[PDB]
Design an enzyme around this catalytic site. Structure first.
Site, mmCIF file in Angstrom:
data_model
loop_
_atom_site.group_PDB
_atom_site.id
_atom_site.type_symbol
_atom_site.label_atom_id
_atom_site.label_comp_id
_atom_site.label_asym_id
_atom_site.label_seq_id
_atom_site.Cartn_x
_atom_site.Cartn_y
_atom_site.Cartn_z
ATOM 1 N N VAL A 124 17.716 35.419 71.014
ATOM 2 C CA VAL A 124 18.781 34.471 70.688
ATOM 3 C C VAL A 124 20.004 34.598 71.596
ATOM 4 C CG1 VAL A 124 20.229 33.508 68.868
ATOM 5 C CG2 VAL A 124 18.019 34.512 68.297
ATOM 6 N N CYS A 125 20.382 35.824 71.951
ATOM 7 C CA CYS A 125 21.530 36.036 72.831
ATOM 8 C C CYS A 125 21.426 35.175 74.082
ATOM 9 C CB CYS A 125 21.633 37.496 73.263
ATOM 10 S SG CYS A 125 22.496 38.546 72.097
ATOM 11 N N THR A 126 20.258 35.184 74.715
ATOM 12 C CA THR A 126 20.038 34.401 75.932
ATOM 13 C C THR A 126 20.155 32.903 75.636
ATOM 14 O OG1 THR A 126 18.543 36.103 76.888
ATOM 15 C CG2 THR A 126 18.417 33.883 77.807
#
Lengths: 160, 161
Positions: B46-48
């Protein structure tokens, strides 16, 4: 406080895919394990007259011992690095600096970064005894995989 | 640790993907508002997706005239790689010492076995150092309202004209 000729302390850590890898279980395989430490992936590596990023850590693969590289990064970061240098071995992280302390292999401070593992190597006999050791207080002091490999192939055929 | 809405955001100074010192109020002295995109871990699923979206929604983020600053507890090295990875434009600060996450009260007690991780949060501190946007999720898998983030962002750069 781990010293050569003694019994290597056991630990458990998450690899690239968060799949916990236990040391002793790795020993139970019947071959020594090469534990290479390092401050943080994707970092530089000085060489007195040649400073680059090019990681030769993948050399250890040649060795006839189990390779387990440990860093204080995260599985995601490490998972990335494994693909980078097509490392064919397992990389375990110690995001909680739990294992690095156990081996006193850590930089209390490195460019403002705390509890960062230092460079080092520990070839552990399939029984749990430290058959080899190498460590440097220098962050960019990379191991000479050439010998560490042969010094492992020795320890392997040593106690078969 | 009480970064309440309306109350000035604690100024800080952290590295850079390029190990360059960055200071909050200093960067605010530019005149534009600030956006602190906190994220648990680089190269995370999710960070990406989140930062990637922040890279793809600059068309409306640039005409908002501000200063985007993502931040996690990963080393300056892990971060530098993350930038070129998705070729981001804004800076990525590292809080290897859990200083700004304990300060801005957005740290995960535990995550997948990992300790002290920056929750996913987005603060928008206007020039006058007052916090205007405070979105903090208890679940690292929840993305912020990217659209509104830029929407309510320009809503500050405008008021300053």
């Amino acid at each position: 406080l781990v010293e050569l000729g003694e019994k290597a302390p056991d630990f458990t850590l998450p690899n690239q895919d968060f799949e916990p890898v236990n040391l002793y279980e790795v020993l139970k395989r019947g071959r020594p394990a090469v534990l290479i430490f390092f401050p943080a992936a994707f970092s530089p590596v000085c060489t007195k007259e040649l400073c680059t990023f090019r990681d030769k850590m993948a050399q250890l693969e040649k060795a006839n011992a189990e390779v387990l590289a440990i860093s204080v990064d995260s599985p995601w970061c490490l998972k990335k690095f494994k693909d980078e240098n097509r490392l064919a071995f397992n990389l375990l992280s110690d995001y909680n600096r739990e294992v690095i302390k156990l081996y006193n292999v850590y930089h209390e401070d490195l460019k403002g970064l705390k509890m960062v593992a230092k460079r080092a190597v520990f070839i552990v006999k399939p029984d749990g005894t430290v058959a080899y050791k190498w460590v440097t207080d220098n962050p960019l002091n990379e191991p000479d995989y050439d010998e560490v490999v042969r010094e492992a192939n020795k320890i392997a055929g040593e106690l078969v």
